[PDB]
């Protein structure tokens, strides 16, 4: 089999469509997602044209091996898509309506800067390499681009699924290449983070600040050290569910900042005790009393600054 | 091969059945389950009809490639089902009886709101896409829908396996699709959760409350902080075995609530000591004595409220 | 290809054999094991009869596709067995000697009640479905059922590998089914559990009991809390290597019981201190002195009871 | 099919090119990386030459099975590359231009000596085996060696992708083998390590040094022990993300060194207390005062020395 | 195809060779290793003989399907080897030179008794089942047994790769079987274990012994308990990287022994305090002073005994 011959010198327009059946396994560390979807391809092949009056048939069904099919690939896939041809239907003018169901593990980078309050744009790049006889160009049939109402991505809200209608046509290894961008806009469900990580982490930080109402060095050491160990456990638990970004993330920034509050609490607790021993409790008293107001105020302002910078 | 032609204009009814052989690997985080089962398909194909007298046989066996077979798919599968055709048989009137054995990893969302005392309804959606020549509608042959008596799903009780007999017929990309809902009702075996998580977690909370019978700030700090660290360990262990839900779960609610009891214990422990230092032990005495009754009472009532809201 | 014809009305007897080459990956949580073995099959197909005078050769060798082969399956497998035909030998009478090497991940439930001192019976169910022309029945050729002397299952002792010679012949979806039970009896190597989990866990419990020789509330609090945290770590480590059973396991029971000893130690430690403060150390003394004998004695008796109930 | 015959006695030059489409999954422990790329091969086959005038075509497209294709393999792959032929084109002089898209898991050893500030050189070894009829030699077509601008390797900066143009021609199993080295130079994004591991770990070490401003043995013990436990947690977290090297790594060296600072702090804390009890606080005072300067100074020098040795 | 006929009654000698290309993924818990290697097979097939002066060609290249190839398998593999035939060459006299490249996951048991200072012997068992027409026997062509100079197994030193030249010929299921033992001698790189596990673990044990220079029960309790918790963390981290052996390992023995030192320290710390309270500090003094010498001495001697027993 060979590709359809051009009437003049025009390139072959292959009309595409992706209808998402299932969305699953969004790996944050791997920056991957698994997809089960329909892929619809359409092009005109004059060699397949027929008379609908004489044949008595409106549509002719073919096997993939029987007719010429354009080699459509995905750019950002781990391995080649697991595909099963659903249908091939030819119209009297020779317009082929190909349909296949596929599953793929797609690599799409993620922006963790606003985590866990971040939104993403997942991509699926459709590509066709032009042949020596004639150039192939991709198009979007919006009537055949969509998603199942039941499509659910665990811990994520699916906003939109659209395609950038204008293909990215470019030279690659002395042959033409037509690329299409299928974009899946999603937003993270941040709810669980609040009672599981954020609030527990804040409560333990506030427990550390009860040392501003104590003169017992021994007890203070125990408070700050313990609550600090709990914070380390949270910092680790958090960093396990995220990849190593070459930038600061919102959660990361907050967590880091909290480490400084623990350091300064240790210093306060230390200074207070040194002074108490040095028979200067009145001076120690002023520092402890100031800390009671300073620590919450500076914590609140630092957070307002941080939130402003990130959002 | 082409589909059977209609006698009038009626759609082709494909009679389905699923007989569960093995149920395994119910992943809570992934919201998946693996299944090994028999799939049976039956439809009338007149072109295959024969006379028993002339042929000398009451049944005719064919190879899948030899005859027309409807393209039946599962909606909620990760990848295409690993299937092996068991038998194909034609009755004299042309009633095809197809059977295959398959294995699939099925995606079915789970409702963790009542965890670990929750019950689920797993789904298997059977689907058929109609062809340009004729419309295909799915049916359930209840005589061919069942499950092996030995079918066991680890940590779960299997209640029922039934099919919603009326198919969900809908338009998708200008072609009729017929969907069938195979429902597997299961209920979690909550037993292990009691001696492994619930009771240990309650015991450590009750240990924290022994600080209401102590005036030793240093000992109290040690109690509350330690028991709190143990609670964090339990909260982490729990959240590892569950996905991030955009809603509160029963276990989650309880765990969260317990964090507040730890906070108020710290406050009590702090206030008591401040007052002792302030040379006001009689006032601290009243607070500590009240706490001895208040903490259990408020804990019990809070739990009754919570259980009421969730169940 | 069609099945062989009966001389009278008798069913086709397919002789079976399983020779275990490798046993590995016994997943306790999954209740699975991987197996590499030889599957032998032998039946008479007179249609393949030959004269070795004419044909030249005494025994003929066929390709699986060339001749009729019974559709033999495994009931309790995750996916279809990875099989590679070793040999197909036909003797002049038409007796087929089919040999194949396979690998499979078998699901066989496990009884954790006596863990880590439990023994299991792993199963491999061979099954054949009877066709329209004639019924197929399975048989065991004991001369072809065995295992390699080198077969080792890590952390387990392999006792026996036998087959229940009488097949379970039953009706299923209006057709006959012949099932065979290949049983692999194994017993857990409990050795490692003693120096790794049991003894460490006992020592830490005994450390808590040194609080019965101390009057220092602050030191006692530290003992019981610490050792309790160590016990939680052990309880977690243990429950990670085990599935969630709807029943109590021996290790589980012991671990749970130990939690009660920690609770009562906390109570003792609390009561002793309260009394000390209440200026009643002589009464506190009696309780502490009693506890020194009571805790070991009650621990020993409770363990005798528990071991009696479980074994 | 047989290989092209030599015009004289010259070997067959197969021109190679690798164009990286996707780079992903760099496993540090496994010392592997997954790759999705184009493999472009080109050789001259005179048997396939044609005249453009009589043929009416400037180029001829073939199926892989139709013509002779050199058996090109990768040396350092886990399993054989998942490959799909894109396009085979023959020019009038018989210059075959082959293109295939592949995915492979490549094993390339990593040098962790300067971790997490290390740079690597990933390798892809292309190999061809010479046949009895003629010797086959590999060449690099630099015009066909490249990478996509979007190629991103998570937690790594991609520097270059080049090929060592001169092949390593050597004997293996009595046949000549031509090897080519495709090198991918990368450098680790060390950013995340600073706020996640390095700084937290330094802060906790500095917290232990507050014991040089305390005379409270009990408080000091609590400081050094706690901070030490936090350091152990960090050391474990670090060694989980790295393989077991038979050499010291930079992070490893630092971590190890810090353990010695903790040991000497314990000794100081111990000696100070012993002396305090021995009614020699003036001598203990000198040691504690010296330690305040000695510990940071000796720490800074130790780090300068270490950084010098490693960079 | 049928096997080569015997000239007399002699068995068919198949000359084997394994040339290791890549060694990777040595799983200690699984007792597996992955291998990428060349498999060479050589046997005389007189039916394939040809004249050299008449035919012109000295060597004839055949496709695997075209000629008879012996069914060579690996005994100790998880699944069947992923193999790709590289070359088949027939000599004038009919000697066949077959070569294939394979990848396999091999199960070879490991002896952890001297861990992490242990050496292993990995095995690859080549096997051939004899046919009804003639017996097949395996041989080793040492000229074709080897390994790549670049072959690296992470955390291991590769000593030798040899084959036991005399095959293990035995009866199995009424047919002859010829087995060959390919042995890969390796030794563990124990370096990393010293700064990561051994030294940290020793240091924390020595920290516990500072309680012999303290009379502060409260401080002593904190020392012994803390350091004990750190030891538990190390014991767990160690047992995670090792399988459950029915025997004692060197590391296991040491770790276990250390638990007894912690127990006796607790007893010492307890007895010392009891005596202090009992107004007998002079007697407590003798015990504490003795412990200062006893604990290191007994620790050193116990280790000498242990090392002697294990090595
Ligand atoms: C300790 C620090 C507490 C963190 C506070 C949340 C950060 C925030 O305010 O996050 C904001 C995000 C919404 O963000 P958005 O619309 O996606 O951003 C794009 C917005 N622009 C384009 C205007 C920049 O979530 C929320 O609705 C906040 C609810 C969570 C409160 C949890 C409190 C405990
Ligand atoms: C402190 C927290 C203790 C948790 C208590 C269990 C919550 C509960 O009462 O759970 C109730 C569930 C039963 O639920 P059901 O049949 O699914 O509900 C459907 C009912 N409707 C439709 C009316 C809403 O479990 C049980 O059988 C109770 C046994 C658990 C005891 C645990 C002891 C500790
Ligand atoms: C804390 C409690 C310590 C647990 C003690 C072991 C439990 C037990 O006594 O285990 C018993 C099992 C034997 O089991 P069996 O052959 O399956 O019994 C079948 C017997 N019937 C049919 C009569 C019921 O192990 C042993 O040989 C004992 C070695 C374990 C020593 C651990 C010391 C600590
Ligand atoms: C406490 C220990 C602090 C560790 C300090 C970083 C080590 C270093 O100096 O790292 C150096 C590497 C870059 O090195 P390069 O280009 O690979 O080396 C080639 C070097 N020659 C040519 C000299 C051999 O990182 C950096 O850019 C340093 C920024 C990180 C600072 C974090 C401090 C907290
Ligand atoms: C406290 C525990 C300290 C552990 C000491 C190492 C054990 C040992 O002494 O190990 C011995 C092995 C050498 O083994 P080999 O020659 O392979 O054995 C075969 C020996 N035969 C044939 C004689 C039986 O390792 C070493 O080279 C020791 C270097 C590590 C020192 C780390 C100190 C901390
Ligand atoms: Cl693709
Ligand atoms: Cl499907
Ligand atoms: Cl099977
Ligand atoms: Cl390859
Ligand atoms: Cl094999
Ligand atoms: Na085609
Ligand atoms: Na068909
Ligand atoms: Na067959
Ligand atoms: Na070819
Ligand atoms: Na062959
Ligand atoms: Na303490
Ligand atoms: Xe997408
Ligand atoms: Xe978070
Ligand atoms: Xe805490
Ligand atoms: Xe956050
Ligand atoms: Xe502190
Ligand atoms: Xe602050
Ligand atoms: Xe189901
Ligand atoms: Xe739970
Ligand atoms: Xe605790
Ligand atoms: Xe719960
Ligand atoms: Xe507290
Ligand atoms: Xe409360
Ligand atoms: Xe078995
Ligand atoms: Xe156990
Ligand atoms: Xe402990
Ligand atoms: Xe046990
Ligand atoms: Xe306690
Ligand atoms: Xe007790
Ligand atoms: Xe590469
Ligand atoms: Xe690091
Ligand atoms: Xe800490
Ligand atoms: Xe570092
Ligand atoms: Xe210390
Ligand atoms: Xe120092
Ligand atoms: Xe090997
Ligand atoms: Xe420690
Ligand atoms: Xe070790
Ligand atoms: Xe060791
Ligand atoms: Xe102790
Ligand atoms: Xe000792």
Numbering used by the authors:
A (entry chain E), B (entry chain A), C (entry chain B), D (entry chain D), E (entry chain C): 5 to 315
Paper text:
To improve the understanding of molecular interactions between xenon and transmembrane receptor targets, we investigated xenon binding with the Gloebacter violaceus ligand-gated ion channel (GLIC), a member of the pLGIC family, using X-ray crystallography under pressurized gas. Previously, the sensitivity of GLIC to gaseous anesthetics has been studied using 2-electrode voltage clamping techniques and this revealed that GLIC currents are inhibited by clinical concentrations of xenon. GLIC, whose X-ray structures has been solved in open, locally-closed (LC)–inactive- and resting-state conformations, is extensively used to identify binding sites of general anesthetics, channel blockers, alcohols, and other allosteric modulators in pLGICs. Here, we show by X-ray diffraction that xenon has multiple and specific binding sites in GLIC either in the open and LC (inactive) conformations, and that these binding sites differ between the two conformations.
Xenon-bound GLIC open and LC structures were obtained from crystals pressurized with 2 MPa (20 bar) of xenon and analysed by X-ray crystallography at 3.1 and 3.4 Å resolution respectively. In GLIC open form, xenon is found at three close but different locations in an intra-subunit cavity located in the upper half of the TMD. This cavity is lined by residues from a single subunit with contributions from helices M1 (Y197, I201, I202 and M205), M2 (V242), M3 (Y254, T255, I258 and I259), M4, the apex of the β6- β7 loop (Y119, P120, F121) and the M2-3 loop (N245). The cavity is accessible from the lipid bilayer, it penetrates the interior of the subunit along a direction that points towards the ECD-TMD interface. The first two locations of xenon are observed at the pocket entrance and were modelled as alternative poses of the same xenon atom with 0.5 occupancy each. The third xenon atom with 0.9 occupancy is deeply buried within the cavity in a highly hydrophobic environment. The xenon atoms are all engaged in van der Waals interactions with the hydrophobic side chains of surrounding residues and the alkyl chains of the lipid molecule. In GLIC open form, the intra-subunit binding site can be considered as a common anesthetic binding site, since it can bind not only xenon, but other anesthetics like propofol, desflurane or bromoform. In GLIC open form, xenon binds between M1 and M2 helices from one subunit and M2 helix from the adjacent subunit in the inner part of the TMD while in GLIC LC form, xenon binds between M1 helix from one subunit and M2 and M3 helices from the adjacent subunit in the outer part of the TMD. The second one, named minor interfacial site, is present only in the GLIC open form and is located in a small hydrophobic cavity in the middle of the TMD.
